[PDB]
């Protein structure tokens, strides 16, 4: 219920993750001594809360990027997987069933395709 983590732990631990994601681990006494090594924390107990929340973060972030913190190794890899080719934007929807007014737009664009029909049971859309 109590001693929930305020702004000071989470803002400090975030900078620690994105720079030290190799040298951080998931053992506290590693990361407590790592936050001795890599950080200047004015209390051991504050270092207990920070490096413990680092172990909270490192457990989360080794499950990929979690909300509120991310690493560019994970972030750019999303963009590297975002070379995704779904189409060539030519299916071919060359002649297939389209709207008759799209057909009339295709008539104004001189290709044409199969046209929808039958105003029946109106509202068309109901």
């Amino acid at each position: 219920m109590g001693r929930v983590r305020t702004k000071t732990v989470k803002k400090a631990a975030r900078v620690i993750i994105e720079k030290y994601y190799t040298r951080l681990g998931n053992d506290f006494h590693t990361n407590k001594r790592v936050c001795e090594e890599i950080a200047i924390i004015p209390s051991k107990k504050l270092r207990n809360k920070i490096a413990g929340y680092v172990t909270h973060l490192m457990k989360r972030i080794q499950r990929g990027p979690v909300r509120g913190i991310s690493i560019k190794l994970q972030e750019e890899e999303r963009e590297r997987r975002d070379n995704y080719v779904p189409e060539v934007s030519a299916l071919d929807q060359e002649i297939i069933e389209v709207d008759p007014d799209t057909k009339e737009m295709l008539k104004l664009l001189d290709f044409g395709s199969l046209s929808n029909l039958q105003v029946t049971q109106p509202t068309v859309g109901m």
């Binding site: 049971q121 109106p122 509202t123 109901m126």
Partner: protein
């Protein structure tokens, strides 16, 4: 101050629906012993039995409370005659709903039997096949016209088809669908339901017919 033991003085009378009901013996009533010191024949043969069809037919429905005057009690058997069928409150106020035209028809119509009956009806509208209106109404002209056909067929079928045949029409509403069907060229009418049957006149001359009702 004063109590008695009147349950040393009641007699059981087998309440009989007519034989156009597949359950004739509806139930039994401990009627107080009809005698000289205690006359109870008027609370025996003047008994109107207000029973739903479930114990009357054997079960199409369990609403539709028939009133049943006992035209003759024949040897501990209340051989009842029809008085008035209903469409009782839970069934009755289910169809009553906002944003529809509630259509009604009260008629007072003599049977082919000696019985004057009242028949009050109810009717309602539908949201039709393609209707995007939330409600379901029309002009009041159509509202008046549907009521005119609804009174007409109801007076017609009860003037014909003597009292027990009125009973033998109206459980799936033999008057009901034709009011919908004749108006279906105008409005197909999702409801016609005759609800208040009130016997206005009740002569006892159909005791042979009471034996034709029963047995």
């Amino acid at each position: 101050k004063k109590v008695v033991d009147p349950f040393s003085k009641k007699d059981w009378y087998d309440v009989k629906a007519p034989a156009m009901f597949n359950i004739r013996n509806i139930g039994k009533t401990l009627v107080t012993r009809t005698q000289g010191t205690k006359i109870a024949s008027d609370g025996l043969k003047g008994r109107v039995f207000e029973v739903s069809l479930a114990d009357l037919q054997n079960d199409e429905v369990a609403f539709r409370k028939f009133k049943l005057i006992t035209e003759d009690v024949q040897g501990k058997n209340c051989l009842t005659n029809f008085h008035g069928m209903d469409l009782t409150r839970d069934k009755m106020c289910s169809m009553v709903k906002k944003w529809q035209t509630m259509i009604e028809a009260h008629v007072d119509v003599k049977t082919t039997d000696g019985y004057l009956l009242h028949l009050f009806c109810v009717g309602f509208t539908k949201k039709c096949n393609n209707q995007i209106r939330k409600t379901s109404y029309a002009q009041h002209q159509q509202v008046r016209q549907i009521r005119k056909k609804m009174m007409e067929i109801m007076t017609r079928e009860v003037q014909t088809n003597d009292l027990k045949e009125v009973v033998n029409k109206l459980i799936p509403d033999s008057i009901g669908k034709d009011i919908e069907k004749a108006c279906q060229s105008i409005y197909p009418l999702h409801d016609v339901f005759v609800r208040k049957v009130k016997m206005l006149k009740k002569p006892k001359f159909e005791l042979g017919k009471l034996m034709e009702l029963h047995g």
